[PDB]
Design a protein around this nucleic acid. Structure first.
Ligand code: ZN
Lengths: 439, 246
DNA sequence: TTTTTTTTTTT
């Protein structure tokens, strides 16, 4: 097609991209921002690679949803990294971690493509290098302005070693500096570090809401834009805390449909973790993943019931009131009709956590003979997942989700580090493909 | 406690009250380093914390991000409540030879390091500087022949340690002052605070800058986003009001 | 100095 005919930054990277394969063995990460169009350049490197015939590349996306839309637009099938690397958990009492079964040779994989390289954590980082062979060449895409992973065990600078100079030399991507786009030029200032300011073209752009009643005014402006529209696919509100979101969905649910319900039949929700169909098997069951984390689903039937839980070694069964919602696949993935038990009460949730601790108190040092009933641990533990409604997600959980219009809520951010606040911004701004309002 | 870190502190009563009797130490090195003065900005916000030193201790107002942001906005009047929360705290440090401590009889007869507050420093300054006219010529408490021991007495008022009752005593010779070995025995108990004064202070300003950034966002003078920090306070309360509006 | 006085978020 167009082949070799682009800009200096686009041309420079690919030539260096070839160099890493062509000159010695080297691994590179690229700090493409948004708007810089490294996705468009990546389309050509897709085309150019087919003439050489190298199959050693693997299409890797860290998240399922990023892999889904990657496969959807490109048309080529891509797999999850959990399947690529066979990461299998290890049941312990204190902690638990998905762990790769063995170091593979990756002989057929002579080149490596990765996305969102900021997300992969450093403790995992050291393990992967030994798994990676020398002949394989690593290519990474990500933004230094993208959001870093959260490690409760360690609070530090913790820049992804993809972004640390010692691991390997890399190259950043230049950007179409000037353009008739107010938000991106404001987004350019966002990457620069200027505070957010409203800039509008033709009535569409960055717009601010100020004053004492700004929020209520912004709320009626929020209400004005949304109305009773049941299609929020392109309307994504983002906030950090789930506390705020919880009070929102409470209030918000009552708005669109005239019901005072915590959850009502017919609602659309998204997984917060993958759905595994677990079978009892020696060692660790890899199970079968049913619904991926980030998978959209449509609720079929909704009801609130209770379920008695009994643990061997604990006398009797213990009733817990929950939501028994049946849900079906919403989207282009494999169709499944299912039913889940879900607890949505703070009273019950603390009731839930307490049972675990008594079971934790008793199981860590059990000795009436035998081993320990942990098949009744996860069977009782895995019966319930945690998911949240569509309208709002955390800036963490809104990453990657490209929607037309974004409404942004800033106040709870001050408890976060400065750099993260700008990385949320970039990610937050990139969620709105068409328009953004800011209060 | 504090003794595990090597510094003595008082075993407070149920009222928090406590009495103890101690003698001081002179200068560990010759003609220098009698005492120390420590500056530390200390505050807690967003659950995040900050307890580290300041380079304006040696007059370097510049090599401290907690010092610079004040001068840009002059929080002393711009936001005095926020100013007081974070403002530099002055810590005075010295070695101490304990005499009597009923709260902890084990602490008696021994030497420590210690940090106190500024009112004592004014009283320490008030005690050391006396005119010639009042007959009583000025007195150094650390003097071997002229020095004095002192007794600390503290009560709590509205959650504050009060010392307004403190009073000094006459001069005092120190027993067994003519033995080098008894002096040496106590001399190793003396420690040099000047070591704490060398190049131990953080030279990397950008490192200190990073930590508070993880401690708290906003507060950028050239960014002016601190106004949005002022603005954020309203929204949380506004959020509470709109919750019932449901 | 009376004391590291708040967040969730990943498989
Ligand atoms: Zn300072």
């Amino acid at each position: 097609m167009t082949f070799d005919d682009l800009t200096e930054g686009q041309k420079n990277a690919f030539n260096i991209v070839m160099k890493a394969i062509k000159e010695k063995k080297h691994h590179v990460t690229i700090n493409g921002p948004a708007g810089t169009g490294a996705t468009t350049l990546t389309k050509f490197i897709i085309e150019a690679l087919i003439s050489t015939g190298e199959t050693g590349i693997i299409l890797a996306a860290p998240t399922h949803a990023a892999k889904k839309i990657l496969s959807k637009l490109s048309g080529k099938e891509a797999s999850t990294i959990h399947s690529i690397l066979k990461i299998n958990p290890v049941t312990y009492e204190e902690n638990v971690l998905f762990e790769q079964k063995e170091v593979p040779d990756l002989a057929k994989c002579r080149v490596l493509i990765c996305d969102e390289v900021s997300m992969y954590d450093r403790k995992l980082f050291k393990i992967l290098l030994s798994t990676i062979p020398p002949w394989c060449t690593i290519i990474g895409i990500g933004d230094n302005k993208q959001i870093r992973p959260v490690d409760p065990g360690e609070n530090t600078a913790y820049i992804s070693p993809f972004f640390t100079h010692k691991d390997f030399y890399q190259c950043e991507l230049t950007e179409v500096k000037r353009s008739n786009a107010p938000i991106i030029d404001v987004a350019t200032d966002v990457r620069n570090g200027k505070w957010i300011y409203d800039k509008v073209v033709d009535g569409h752009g960055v717009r601010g809401f100020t004053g004492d009643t700004a929020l209520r005014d912004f709320m009626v402006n929020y209400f004005s834009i949304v109305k009773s529209l049941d299609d929020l696919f392109e309307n994504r509100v983002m906030a950090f805390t789930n506390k705020s979101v919880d009070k929102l969905n409470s209030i918000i649910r009552k708005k669109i449909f005239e019901t005072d319900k915590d959850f009502i039949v017919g609602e659309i929700i998204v997984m917060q973790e993958p759905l595994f169909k677990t079978y009892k098997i020696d060692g660790k069951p890899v199970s079968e993943i049913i619904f991926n984390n980030g998978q959209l689903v449509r609720i079929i039937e909704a009801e609130y019931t209770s379920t008695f839980v009994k643990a061997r070694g604990v006398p009797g069964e213990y009733l817990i009131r929950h939501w028994d919602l049946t849900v079906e696949t919403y989207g282009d993935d494999e169709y499944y009709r299912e039913k889940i038990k879900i607890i949505s009460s703070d009273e019950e949730l603390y009731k839930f956590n307490l049972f675990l601790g008594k079971t934790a108190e008793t199981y860590k040092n059990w000795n009436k003979g035998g081993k320990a009933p942990w098949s009744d641990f996860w069977d009782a533990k895995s019966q319930f997942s945690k998911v949240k409604a569509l309208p709002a997600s955390t800036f963490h959980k809104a990453q990657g989700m490209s929607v037309d219009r974004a409404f942004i809520y800033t106040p709870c951010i001050h408890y976060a580090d400065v750099e993260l606040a700008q990385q949320l911004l970039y990610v937050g701004v990139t969620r709105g493909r068409y328009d953004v309002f800011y209060v | 406690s504090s003794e595990d870190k090597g510094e003595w502190k008082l075993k407070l009563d149920n009222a928090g009250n406590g009495q103890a009797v101690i003698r001081f130490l002179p200068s560990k090195n010759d003609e220098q380093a009698p005492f120390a003065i420590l500056v530390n900005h200390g505050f807690k916000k967003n659950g995040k914390w900050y307890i580290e030193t300041c380079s304006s201790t040696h007059g370097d107002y510049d090599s401290c991000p907690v010092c610079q942001y004040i001068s840009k906005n002059d929080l002393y009047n711009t936001d005095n409540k926020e100013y007081s929360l974070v403002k530099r705290k002055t810590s005075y440090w010295a070695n101490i030879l304990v005499v009597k401590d009923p709260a902890a009889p084990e602490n008696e007869g021994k030497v420590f390091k210690y940090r106190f507050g500024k009112k004592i420093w004014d009283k320490i300054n008030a005690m050391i500087a006396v005119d010639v006219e009042m007959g009583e010529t000025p007195v150094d408490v650390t003097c071997p022949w002229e020095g004095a021991n002192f007794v600390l007495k503290v009560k709590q008022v509205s959650g504050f340690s009060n010392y307004d009752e403190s009073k000094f005593l006459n001069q005092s010779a120190i027993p067994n002052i003519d033995d080098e070995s008894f002096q040496k025995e106590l001399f190793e108990q003396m420690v040099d605070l000047s070591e704490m004064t060398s190049k131990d202070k953080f030279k990397s300003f950008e490192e200190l800058n990073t930590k508070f950034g993880q401690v708290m966002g906003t507060a950028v003078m050239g960014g002016a986003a601190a106004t949005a920090a002022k603005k954020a306070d309203k929204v949380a309360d506004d959020l509470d009001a709109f919750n019932v509006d449901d």
